[PDB]
């Protein structure tokens, strides 16, 4: 059924790559290749606040 | 009052005494006025401050994010997460309400005990040289100047010094 005028679906995926590791992509089609990647260090804890209060 | 001093045999408090919690009202030929007992007042302030500090400082926490996000197919753990939050809310609320209720009762009795002790300390110093007349008041059978007055506040009243002066006056007031 049409969702935002689309009848096809796009399933997104993610993973974390540790230092000294390689990620390999292989496809004959139906692949959305990455363009930008983020290097990050997670901070333990913290959450997400959902409110209209300004910052 | 538990000890019967505050709102007991001392019917009311003094607004003329502003320098302390417990103290004295004296009267002699040199005049009259209000004074606060430094020793008993400071020892009660320290206990109350320790009481307030104990309630607050013993509560030590760490960094923590309460917020948890779940989808529409994770209702059970979402209900489990809500059950954890609600259970903590009920436990903390009941303890906090009862802690204030019980400690407020203890604090008022603590002031009652201190007032009673101060009266008895003065009573032990004067012995039969003074007559109890209620309202936490003493009447001296001998003249007591400013030096004699604060000597009771000091805690250094000389019973034998005025023992014979007061004894002679004791047997004449009562016919
Ligand atoms: C006790 O009070 C009297 C009142 O002036 C004073 O003479 C004496 O020095 C006092 N004792 C003290 C302050 O240790």
UniProtKB/TrEMBL annotation, chain A:
Annotated organism of origin: Influenza A virus (strain swl A/California/04/2009 H1N1)
Organism superkingdom: Viruses
Subunit: Homotrimer of disulfide-linked HA1-HA2. Interacts with human CACNA1C.
Coiled-coil segments: none
Subcellular location: Host apical cell membrane; Virion membrane
Name of the protein this chain belongs to: Hemagglutinin
Reported modifications of this chain: Palmitoylated. In natural infection, inactive HA is matured into HA1 and HA2 outside the cell by one or more trypsin-like, arginine-specific endoprotease secreted by the bronchial epithelial cells. One identified protease that may be involved in this process is secreted in lungs by club cells.
Protein encoded by which gene: HA
Function: Binds to sialic acid-containing receptors on the cell surface, bringing about the attachment of the virus particle to the cell. This attachment induces virion internalization either through clathrin-dependent endocytosis or through clathrin- and caveolin-independent pathway. Plays a major role in the determination of host range restriction and virulence. Class I viral fusion protein. Responsible for penetration of the virus into the cell cytoplasm by mediating the fusion of the membrane of the endocytosed virus particle with the endosomal membrane.
Family: Belongs to the influenza viruses hemagglutinin family.
TrEMBL record, chain B:
Location within or outside the cell: Host apical cell membrane
Superkingdom, natural source: Viruses
Protein family: Belongs to the influenza viruses hemagglutinin family.
Assembly: Homotrimer of disulfide-linked HA1-HA2. Interacts with human CACNA1C.
Function: Binds to sialic acid-containing receptors on the cell surface, bringing about the attachment of the virus particle to the cell. This attachment induces virion internalization of about two third of the virus particles through clathrin-dependent endocytosis and about one third through a clathrin- and caveolin-independent pathway. Plays a major role in the determination of host range restriction and virulence. Class I viral fusion protein.
Protein name: Hemagglutinin
Organism: Influenza A virus
Residues of the full protein shown: 326 to 499 of 534
């Amino acid at each position: 059924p049409k969702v935002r005028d689309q009848e096809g679906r796009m399933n997104y995926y993610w993973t974390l790559v540790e230092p000294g590791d390689k990620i390999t992509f292989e496809a004959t089609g139906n692949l959305v290749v990455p363009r930008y990647a983020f290097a990050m260090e997670r901070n333990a804890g913290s959450g997400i606040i959902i409110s209209d209060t300004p910052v | 009052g538990l000890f019967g001093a505050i709102a007991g045999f001392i019917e009311g408090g003094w607004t003329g005494m502003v320098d302390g919690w417990y103290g004295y009202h004296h009267q002699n030929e040199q005049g009259s006025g209000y004074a606060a007992d430094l020793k008993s007042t400071q020892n009660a302030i320290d206990g109350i401050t320790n009481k307030v500090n104990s309630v607050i400082e013993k509560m030590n926490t760490q960094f923590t994010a309460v917020g948890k996000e779940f989808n529409h197919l994770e209702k059970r753990i979402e209900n489990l997460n809500k059950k954890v939050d609600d259970g903590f809310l009920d436990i903390w609320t009941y303890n906090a309400e009862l802690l204030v209720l019980l400690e407020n009762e203890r604090t008022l009795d603590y002031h009652d005990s201190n007032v009673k002790n101060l009266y008895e300390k003065v009573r032990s110093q004067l012995k039969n040289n003074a007559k109890e007349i209620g309202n936490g008041c003493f009447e001296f059978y001998h003249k007591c100047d400013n030096t004699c007055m604060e000597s009771v506040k000091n805690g250094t009243y000389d019973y034998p010094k005025y023992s014979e002066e007061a004894k002679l006056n004791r047997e004449e007031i009562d016919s």
